[PDB]
Amino acid sequence: CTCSPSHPQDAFCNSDIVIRAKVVGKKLVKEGPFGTLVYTIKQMKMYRGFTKMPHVQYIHTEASESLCGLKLEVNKYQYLLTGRVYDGKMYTGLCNFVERWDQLTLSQRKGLNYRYHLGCN
Template sequence: MYRGFKKMPHVQYIYTESSESLCGVKLEVNKYQYLITGRVYEGKVYTGLCNLIEKWDKLTLPQRKGLNHRYHQGCSCKIKPCYYLPCFITSKSECLWTDLLSNFGTPGYQSKNYVCVKQKEGYCSWSRGWTPQDRSVINTTDP
């Protein structure tokens, strides 16, 4: 499954650096399915250690459903990372991401179970992965 057909209608290769010391990634091709994020530059798709790369079966159910059904609802929202307290949002289009406070930069409970989406009132907030959007809105400073 591939997203981004408008920008790249055909992808034959995904490029990365040759070693991890140069931020390259090693994938076990034809053994696992992966979620791979990256960028398109001069007609080629690139990925590396700074991009999100995860085995599909290691994603939580809310993450998989979010990728297929919910994350696009947050395209106009910005996720603002919180590295240390105090943290604040500065506009109604931001969701405060607090996983970095307790997980040392690794995805934590918030990123595994919530999605930042625009609400009916026009502001962005965290919503539990697959439950109907209006029922599970949480405060932007929660998890």
């Protein structure tokens, strides 16, 4: 899987969901060619996607990284997640804007708050 990073303000509006949820829960693997993975997360402050899918609980991703599967971590720190809504579910991929809330610099969180603009619409 290969991604080309771009702008986070663009990624923000392009995504259906933008939350700062935690992964205090865990990860569950499924069957198939290579497999699917489903993380259980406790949402917190949603910044986008109140309409589409108000409050998310399960985030789906491919199990294989080569197929753009997303790699997170159990009962660990907070993440700023983005994703899409499809058939009543949220799917995130390696190419989606994702970052540990820890690493998120003061500069970025400042730009994140520039959500007030909501630009999108």
